[PDB]
Design a protein around this ligand. Structure first.
Ligand SMILES: OC[C@H]1O[C@@H](O[C@H]2[C@H](O)[C@@H](O)[C@H](O)O[C@@H]2CO)[C@H](O)[C@@H](O)[C@H]1O
Ligand SMILES: OC[C@H]1O[C@@H](O[C@H]2[C@H](O)[C@@H](O)[C@H](O)O[C@@H]2CO)[C@H](O)[C@@H](O)[C@H]1O
Lengths: 138, 138
């Protein structure tokens, strides 16, 4: 891996920001690797989470938020167009009302803001992946 | 311009970070547009500056830092391979001992750290340019 995992990046996000994550799962899909991205409101991992994104490769994605320390209503999609064994590109674009999530150029979901994205102070990338790069663009 | 100018981006920099700035001068070179990039230690524009980079297009570049409110010893280079009227790409890569500055893929200078780059909390891009994008990569 080019970066440590878990990778905790301090960030300032605004509408128009794009978080681009490139990496590779460290297990084949029959071994169910996971990839997790958390948009944290502080560096402390017990802080609230504006957007939690957990992929079970070859299976499904779960999304949620954590508010006042409580996990809210979970959202899910079965569209996870990752390829077994290959590097992926995960783009999270901050729109005015939602995070748009793209996997290898394919829009899979729009997760609507329940707190403003400017409250996000740290992005954590975790679980069963090797990381090539993380970019934050405006 | 795609972004406001002056553009003040809150950042966290570490060794291995790369700041990529894409834009276009808003005047032809015979009218001496300038481009300025400041690595500020706070959002306040009177805070100390770890790395100040001021291009006079078609002429020369000045670099400096501001410590305890005082401008230090100015450094300069005449290598400024920007093209009149065209979009440029300005990359500032954070090495362990210096900032490496590349203009349109060409390394022009290495500005050595006098305070650690982790002290940089805001990057300001200013003066006579239109901005296409600013990315911070690790
Ligand atoms: O919702 C994200 C959140 O889910 C937790 O796991 C859920 C699980 O997805 C669900 O199937 C089960 O019924 O309840 C669990 C508790 O909410 C995870 O523990 C948590 O880390 C998040 O991933
Ligand atoms: O060194 C960067 C700093 O320079 C100031 O201008 C200098 C100028 O470059 C020099 O030729 C003259 O002799 O002294 C001036 C004052 O230091 C700028 O005013 C400042 O904004 C920075 O660009």
């Amino acid at each position: 891996s080019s970066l440590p995992v878990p990778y905790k990046l301090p960030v300032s996000l605004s509408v128009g920001s794009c978080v681009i994550i490139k990496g590779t799962p460290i297990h084949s899909f029959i071994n169910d690797p996971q990839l997790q991205v958390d948009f944290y409101t502080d560096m402390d991992e017990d802080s609230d989470i504006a957007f939690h994104f957990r992929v079970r490769f070859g299976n499904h994605v779960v999304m949620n938020r954590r508010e006042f320390g409580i996990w809210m209503l979970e959202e899910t999609t079965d569209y996870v167009p990752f390829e077994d064994g290959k590097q992926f590109e995960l783009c999270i674009y901050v729109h005015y009302n939602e995070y748009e999530i793209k996997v290898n150029g394919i829009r899979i979901y729009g997760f609507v803001h329940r707190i403003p994205p400017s409250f996000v102070k740290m992005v954590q990338v975790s679980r069963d992946i090797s990381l090539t790069s993380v970019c934050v663009c405006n």
